Design an enzyme around this catalytic site. Sequence first.
Site, short mmCIF file in Angstrom:
data_model
loop_
_atom_site.label_atom_id
_atom_site.label_comp_id
_atom_site.label_asym_id
_atom_site.label_seq_id
_atom_site.Cartn_x
_atom_site.Cartn_y
_atom_site.Cartn_z
N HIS A 289 0.87 -1.20 0.00
CA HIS A 289 0.00 0.00 0.00
C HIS A 289 0.89 1.23 0.00
O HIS A 289 1.66 1.42 0.94
CB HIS A 289 -0.97 0.01 1.18
CG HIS A 289 -1.66 1.32 1.30
ND1 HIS A 289 -2.55 1.76 0.33
CD2 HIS A 289 -1.58 2.31 2.22
CE1 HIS A 289 -3.01 2.95 0.67
NE2 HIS A 289 -2.43 3.31 1.83
N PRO A 293 5.29 8.46 -0.66
CA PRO A 293 6.63 8.09 -1.11
C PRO A 293 7.55 7.65 0.04
O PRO A 293 8.35 6.78 -0.19
CB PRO A 293 7.13 9.35 -1.83
CG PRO A 293 6.30 10.47 -1.25
CD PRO A 293 4.96 9.87 -0.91
N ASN A 322 -3.02 8.15 -3.84
CA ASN A 322 -3.43 7.20 -2.79
C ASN A 322 -4.96 7.13 -2.78
O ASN A 322 -5.59 8.12 -2.40
CB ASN A 322 -2.85 7.62 -1.44
CG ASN A 322 -3.23 6.70 -0.30
OD1 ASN A 322 -4.12 5.86 -0.43
ND2 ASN A 322 -2.55 6.85 0.82
#
Length: 376
Positions: A289, A293, A322
């Site tokens: 997931h 970064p 995301n």
Amino acid sequence: GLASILAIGTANPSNCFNQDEFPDYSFRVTKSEHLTSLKDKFKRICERSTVRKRYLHLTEELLQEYPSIATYDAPSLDARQEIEVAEVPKLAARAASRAIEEWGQPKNKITHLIFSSTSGIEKPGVDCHLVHLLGLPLSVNRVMLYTIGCHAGGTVLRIAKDLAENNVGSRVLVVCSELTVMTFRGPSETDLANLIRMGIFGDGAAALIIGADPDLSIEKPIFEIFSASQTLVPNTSKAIRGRVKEMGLTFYVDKMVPTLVASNIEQCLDKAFSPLGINDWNSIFWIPHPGGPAILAEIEAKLELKPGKLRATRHVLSEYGNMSGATVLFILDEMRRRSKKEGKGTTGDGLEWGVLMGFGPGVTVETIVLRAISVV
């Protein structure tokens, strides 16, 4: 045999936001362009995000119709709920339609529905809304998971495995449908976590069909779910926080979350892969997931992963941002598609074994061992 992903569909809101232009856009529609110091801090956040585009349901038009959402603390939950109880199922339906079309089978054969959403908490739930939108059988066994959230990709695969494997002939529609409508708020120097959030998080829905013992005459396994484990990192409640409030869903991710995850990932990997006698983290394909970064950087550093291990993950983070629980399912799709396009021997970048990991509130780590399928 093992619960197998037979099809993967994805969908995003039709409105696309370039990261280059997002600081100007976000600070204008939240009436914050005079906060030049704070806007500079957010551009820097956006430049380091590695996010190039996101798809967002929230447009300037919706913020003008629901101006409470464009503020930070004004009562806005009713407005957010009005948008999301409609939109979460609609985006879910688009992703499920793509998954069902790839699958190629009639919807009469779908026996279970697992639906994960942060947003649209209502009775009856977005799971029921989705049944009526898709025209799924009324007898479909539903699991509605509200507000998990970021590790939900691993959660729905863990639940899908046991449903698929315990019910002969069962076909599980799994859907993660994530809009940022519930969490979006104006920028403030009093909330750094929400500046990061409004930089990194995008909207998306991913659907997949899981079944054990596919009919290989008509169904094509893409990945097998070998095993699924969940764990809590001790004394890390309060590291990832959110509450449904009058102002919508609040959001806090601690700056230490990258370190916490990297500090715990080895135990999860050891428990998952010791039974297989697997030890070399460069010998398996990777679906971590991508919280941001920094989390990807810390995993690479800690496990000393080769430069290309997280290519697929970085691609999805760069191209969609995301999308919470949905993200790892987008990455599954990216990995199988890249694998076919580059003529790899398996759906998992030519490798046999893979790990998919969710990181979310708890702090929770969801560890799924995947088996790739041989392509010819």
